[PDB]
Amino acid sequence: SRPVSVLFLCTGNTARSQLAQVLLEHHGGGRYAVTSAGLEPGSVNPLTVQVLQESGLPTGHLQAKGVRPLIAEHFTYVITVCDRAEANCPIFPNATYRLHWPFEDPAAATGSEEERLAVFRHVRDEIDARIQAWVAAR
């Protein structure tokens, strides 16, 4: 049985959408074909990598990538993980369902590395929870 296609959509594809991609890869297994992309791609935040690796989740395949090369693709679910109020939080044209799971931008948090890592861990855990519940309802 072929997998359900999911695009996690964000601003820079550096944090929330990368966390979501890896967490759905983990909890969903082969049931989902998972992509993440951003409107204005940056670079995966090192704290994104750190908090995933702390959980034993691999990150070597993560790359910040733009949504423009995907504009002709269709996804059964497009799940926007930036707040629509954020600048460069985009919309995607080809989807069956558009879900909006705004999460706090962990990369916007300030303070020491340890204080920022705490925010990244909190957002990781929130995304993890939402993904577990979403997979379980299917």
Residue numbers in the entry: 6 to 143
Quote from the publication:
D. indicus contains the typical arsRBC operon that encodes two regulatory proteins (ArsR1 and ArsR2), two arsenate reductases (ArsC2 and ArsC3) and an arsenite efflux pump protein (ArsB). In order to explore the difference between the two species, D. radiodurans and D. indicus, to the arsenate resistance we analyzed the arsenate reductases that belong to the ars operon, which are able to convert As(V) into As(III).
Thus, we undertook the structural studies of DiArsC2 and we were able to crystallize two different forms of the enzyme: native (DiArsC2) and bound to arsenite (DiArsC2-As). The crystal structures of DiArsC2 and DiArsC2-As were determined and refined at resolutions of 1.65 and 1.50 Å, respectively. In the case of the DiArsC2-As structure, a disulfide bridge between Cys87 and Cys94 is formed. Moreover, the arsenate is located in a positive-charged pocket which is accessible from the external environment. The DiArsc2-As structure represents the final stage, where Cys15 is bound to As(III), however the ligand cannot be released since Cys87 forms a disulfide bridge with Cys94. Since in our DiArsC2 structure the disulfide bridge between these two residues is not formed (at least in chain B, where density is observed) this could indicate that an As(V) reduction event already took place in the DiArsC2-As structure, leading to the formation of the Cys87 – Cys94 disulfide bridge. In fact this loop is readily accessible by the thioredoxin reductase system to reduce the Cys87 – Cys94 disulfide bridge and allow a new As(V) reduction cycle to occur.
